Design a protein around this ligand. Structure first.
Ligand code: XYP
Ligand code: XYP
Lengths: 753, 761
């Protein structure tokens, strides 16, 4: 029995033993990948014939054995068992494969629940609920033999033109970091042998491209890069022990992230102590040549990516095969191959793959998590505006108008299987279905398509509105990767107008003088400047997946009290970009008239905005001690009372302001929050335990510091709807924050007195 | 006498002698300033009473003795002579004042020519002509006793939302640097005792504020900062020997430029060898407290600005008076005061102020340079579009429509005196002096055109009252000339200028609707934009027959527009900045990386092209130019070698005209990503009909240097692409040459510019 096969030996001993036994060819194969679809026949069964060519020397990863085959869970599990049996039994060393799938909004394959999009997850401000979700996704993935999910997007979004806004947790480094750590914790176990490797992406800056254009340069200076952009990845590595990172397609200031050793090694591995694998974004190595034009051939692209710190080329071996030739010709040292292979082998051993690489096909049927999807959908929907029309009485005749009332497909995000892809059909409930099921009397008129300028349908929509009590206009996006989609990866929107003639559809329906409820089923903020004052209520419904219809109707009729809060600012117009809550004293205004000539510098809806069908009263602000030394702790308490007549969740938000630091600081920035459930007339105390570590920022010399001085405390229902204000002082000498530090405020509830 | 008063002693000896004689109070006064208006009575005469308080211990600078007093040139000269006599005769040490004025578009005071705005200057692509202009401004300034002009703005503009776009030379670091060096050379001349100190501003990044908003953070990473924003300042310091720099109001990534020693000292003085004075932007020191909130009081703001490298607080001593208290209390070293005073005194001696601080009031009448202003206006106007309607025949009946056809005030930029300065006596005096400037209406009458004028709308507001009159005059005419765009200045009623940022880039008020209404008559339409920024023309471009871009042209504007419309002048201006299709497209610039200027993998936005409506270098002619016979010699050059690029250009059309020949350089397979194409050379060439000439670009490899992964300035072996054309998109001839040898680190002084000339074909 070779040491690497012996389960009593420590993993480092098994890794060293296996590495010492491997040829150069076997080493380079562990840094590569193959598509699931390249290993099946036309009957969807494992093809030994194809495996003999592609798997002869073993392999790092199988890419999307479920997601790329259109196989049902048990068929996918059978394919993976067969791939593994070939590797374990018909290769010299019998190294098993790691399998990855997409899983952002749930396992991206047939039979997997479509959870609401990441921007919806963020809008819950409920990290525990996102952890519950990814704990369910973990079980789904392990059933089909999948070890790695291309997991939370930790890109901080302040440019809603960008088609991937829907995949982010929004504009706030704090909220993004807090959701990212809960997401990673749910996916990964305490013990990864019983869990799924999370992949934080896209490291780093990919959400701040020139003009919001996909893959365009992300030109971010160092303090902003560290405090925004890197912060959530830092928290995922150090607090959540994330085991994979995927690079950004974009250059930072001349350097493609896939060729940046200062980023993928010096920051990620050396500064932060990351011990997992870096996987390329798909084709990110090859396009160092094709797109960025800094690699003269595939072998130079391979050298740049390996030197940078990419361990696995995805989604298929292309450049990394030439690492063999680079060593044989003495261009690179085999020792650098060994370093990457060591990280891959370590993770394979930790995942339990050498003890048992197989799953029980009989237990591989994936269960529905519609219950969890529905709780996210119900908590994620945001009431942007309500003049009193909502909630509606069930006896009102409804004119249900718009492309996103009827569609079902337009409820789905860019990484939901049925959008991303006769096969496990769209038996997903529509909004129209949810209205029927709720017993509402309505007529449906489509009014218009998502795209185009055809106004044919306007007259039917107008006529249905005139014969109704209330018009419910359901407009917004089709999310995906193709030209006909208005949002999603590769679908960037310069001017932030609702797609096609949807805005004109709303204004035409409004001209009937009937009450209008505007339901935005969208992947990004749109400019509502021209419709906001012409409609009575506005619901923001971030691409909600399969639970969307029921949640929208539940909220419209007050069976659910809306509790979602914006995780990203809604610009008045594209020309206002960017707008975010944590501007410096000189940000978020034009000096000395405050506004643009043509436009407010304030967003239409601010960060943390979301209304309720009840009222919350904040009282009794306590900040103790009042003076703390630079590594001390302050305890901030507020009482919150539901003074209205409906049960509701309030999201209590802590903003911290700093002036007279050695650098300029945000006038206010989110540093804590708590979703608190309050029955009508119930009062509770929300408590924020704020360690000074959490308030650390980079000084003029790029040191992480806490400086003596006064911090402003602002607690409220949004970044603008601040209810209580106070301060505390840090007293003592400037502190350099070195090594491990706290990233998060600790937020809980107490009985009020 | 004392060594400092002895003109046979070297300046360094005179400086050391004077410094050793000065009290702490006299030293700190040399780092301060006083407004001209603080030293006059109500009649605009020098007030000894006021001077005894403000000038008792001497002073660094007098701020705008002409620009802030509303005095005529000879009255301003008399005030400055009196200020100087007080300082020379009634202070202990008799140190004279340095005087500064604004002078971007000419001396900013009564009696000064209003030259076209800087964005117009850039549109000429004629650096020699801008040098001729600032040589004239130099004589104007020296007549009234003014020693320093706050002029060449070297901010690189790629965000047309920004109200100060009009003050820049546009988007191209190369074109900005090339115009900046000519601007500075004209103002300074070879010996500064006979010249005027140029002040490059605003150091550094002030044109790239968050959302195009005035003073908002300018968050620029290091390679882009060095190659785009710093480059023109670097060329101005090292090639043009500029003697003053003014800081930016903005923070870079948490650090206000006024408090940034790494910027104002480590880059400017240590890395580049700048020997002149850094002057604050107005109140830039005080607002370290009031705006940025990083100084707890005026004394801490003073310490941050002095440590950073600001020598003179403008426009009035406010924080810098507390430097005295900071030394007396042992918070800062007097040695740091001494270093700043040394720079101020050195410049005063070099200006000749200790030998003769006075001017002849009798010779202080400033001459008109309308001739130079007219050459700039005629060379700056850009023909964006022409289906053949231009030039017009003089016998066509013209409907002259729009707020900028009739309003002479809207010809003026934000630093032209009559626009900038706005008791009841000041209002009357502006309205009085305003009547002197020819209007566009005046130019049409003078040319003998048959026209009716309708002011279809105001610049701002939503009043469509005037539309009907405008439409009716259009229907009775052969051609509608619609003249629309900006009112430039600093107040709420202005649409462009400092503090007037435009988020959505729509023509102001209902001007766009006025254009579309006139177009609906089915009459031919010539659209004339009199503007300080690119506007979105997306909704009008395809509805009009011709478009002229007329960057705020000053007093020569009317005549130049009429000359061009009737073909007395062949238009030859080229865009120095990209015209976005929409605000949501921002930024668009010609020198994007392979991954810039597109969304991957469909190329375009869902709703919009990623390409500008009009690209960098765009400008049509009433003739056609044919490019042939591209030569690049040698084909292989070592990393400090030279390539000679030659093209023949023939005027194949029917009219004499100027072509601006543009050299773009591309680089792939560097160790960093490089622009697909970037302007590295240009030449304005005059061609008679059927005349052919050879344009020659002498390109030293120094000019192509870029920053590598380790932040070294390098030339790397490989291929450089040569693209010569009539715009950044209208490329006529391409080829390439190779750099062969070992990677070169470009150390110390290097060439910044291609050498461009003409020879016989
Ligand atoms: O997010 C990644 C995306 O950028 C790429 O196209 O495909 C792989 C994904 O994991
Ligand atoms: O351009 C400068 C401007 O920024 C400031 O407002 O006043 C002084 C000028 O020189």
């Amino acid at each position: 029995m070779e040491l690497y096969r012996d389960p009593s030996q420590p993993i480092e001993v098994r890794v060293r033993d296996l590495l010492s036994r491997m040829t150069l060819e076997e080493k380079v194969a562990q840094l590569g990948s193959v598509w699931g679809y390249e290993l099946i026949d036309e009957r969807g069964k494992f093809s030994r014939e194809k495996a003999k060519e592609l798997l002869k020397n073993g392999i790092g990863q199988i890419t999307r054995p479920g997601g790329s085959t259109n196989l049902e869970p048990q068929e996918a599990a059978e394919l993976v068992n067969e791939i593994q049996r070939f590797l374990v039994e018909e290769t010299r060393l019998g190294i098993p494969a790691m399998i990855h799938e997409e899983c952002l909004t749930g396992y991206m394959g047939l039979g997997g629940t479509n959870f609401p999009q990441a921007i919806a997850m963020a809008s819950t401000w409920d990290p525990d609920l996102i952890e519950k979700m990814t704990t369910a996704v973990r079980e789904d993935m392990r059933k089909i033999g999948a070890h790695q999910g291309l997991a939370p997007v930790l890109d901080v979004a302040r440019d809603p033109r960008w088609g991937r806004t829907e995949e982010t947790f929004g504009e706030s480094p704090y909220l993004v970091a807090r959701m990212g750590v809960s997401y990673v914790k749910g996916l990964q176990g305490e013990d990864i042998k019983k869990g799924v490797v999370a992949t934080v992406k896209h490291f780093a800056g990919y959400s701040a491209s020139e003009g919001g254009k996909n893959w365009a340069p992300t030109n971010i200076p160092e303090r902003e890069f560290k405090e925004v952009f890197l912060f959530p990845f830092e928290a995922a590595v150090k607090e959540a022990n994330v085991l994979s990172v995927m690079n950004s397609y974009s250059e930072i200031d001349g350097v493609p992230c896939a060729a940046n050793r200062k980023l993928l090694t010096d920051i990620l591995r050396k500064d932060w102590g990351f011990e997992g694998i870096v996987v390329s974004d798909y084709f990110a190595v090859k396009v160092l040549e094709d797109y960025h034009r800094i690699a003269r051939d595939k072998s130079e692209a391979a050298r740049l990516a390996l030197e940078a710190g990419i361990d696995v080329e995805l989604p298929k071996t292309e450049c990394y095969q030439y690492l063999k030739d680079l060593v044989e010709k003495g261009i690179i040292s085999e020792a650098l191959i060994d370093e990457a292979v060591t990280r891959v082998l370590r993770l394979k051993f930790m995942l339990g793959l050498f003890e048992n690489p197989y799953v029980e096909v009989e237990k591989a049927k994936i269960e529905s998590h519609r219950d969890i999807a529905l709780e996210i959908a119900r908590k994620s929907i945001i009431l942007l505006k309500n003049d009193g029309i909502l909630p509606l009485q069930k006896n009102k005749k409804v004119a249900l108008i718009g492309p996103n009332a009827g569609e079902v497909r337009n409820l789905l995000g860019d990484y939901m299987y049925l959008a991303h892809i006769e096969e496990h059909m769209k038996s997903i409930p529509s909004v129209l279905d949810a209205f029927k099921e709720e017993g509402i009397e309505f007529e449906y008129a489509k009014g218009c398509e998502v795209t185009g300028e055809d106004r044919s349908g306007f007259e039917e929509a107008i006529e249905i509105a005139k014969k109704s009590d209330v018009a419910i206009v359901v407009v917004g996006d089709k999310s995906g990767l193709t030209l006909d989609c208005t949002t999603g990866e590769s679908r960037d929107m310069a001017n932030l107008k609702l797609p096609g003639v949807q805005e004109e559809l709303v204004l035409e329906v409004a001209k009937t003088g009937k009450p209008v409820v505007l339901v935005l089923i969208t992947g990004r903020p749109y400019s509502l400047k021209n419709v906001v004052d012409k409609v009575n209520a506005i619901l923001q419904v971030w691409l909600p997946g399969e639970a969307g219809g029921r949640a929208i109707v539940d909220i419209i009729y007050g069976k659910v009290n809306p509790s979602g809060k914006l995780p990203i600012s809604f610009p008045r117009s594209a020309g206002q970009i960017p707008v975010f809550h944590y501007v410096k004293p000189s940000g978020g205004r034009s000096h000395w008239h405050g506004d643009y000539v043509d436009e407010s510098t304030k967003p239409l809806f601010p960060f943390g905005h979301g209304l309720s069908y009840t009222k919350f009263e904040y009282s009794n602000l306590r900040i103790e001690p009042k003076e703390v030394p630079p590594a001390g702790e302050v305890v901030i308490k507020v009482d919150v009372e539901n003074i209205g007549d409906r049960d509701g969740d309030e999201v209590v938000q802590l903003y911290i302001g700093r002036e007279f630091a050695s650098v300029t600081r945000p006038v206010k920035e989110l540093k804590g929050f708590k979703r608190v459930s309050l029955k009508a007339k119930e009062k509770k105390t929300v408590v924020f335990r704020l360690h000074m570590d959490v308030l650390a920022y980079y000084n003029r010399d790029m040191k992480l510091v806490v400086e003596p001085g006064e911090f402003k405390v602002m607690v409220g229902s949004s970044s603008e709807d601040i209810r209580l204000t106070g301060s505390f002082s840090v007293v003592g000498e400037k502190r350099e924050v070195v090594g491990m530090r706290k990233f998060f405020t600790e937020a809980c509830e107490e009985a009020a007195a």
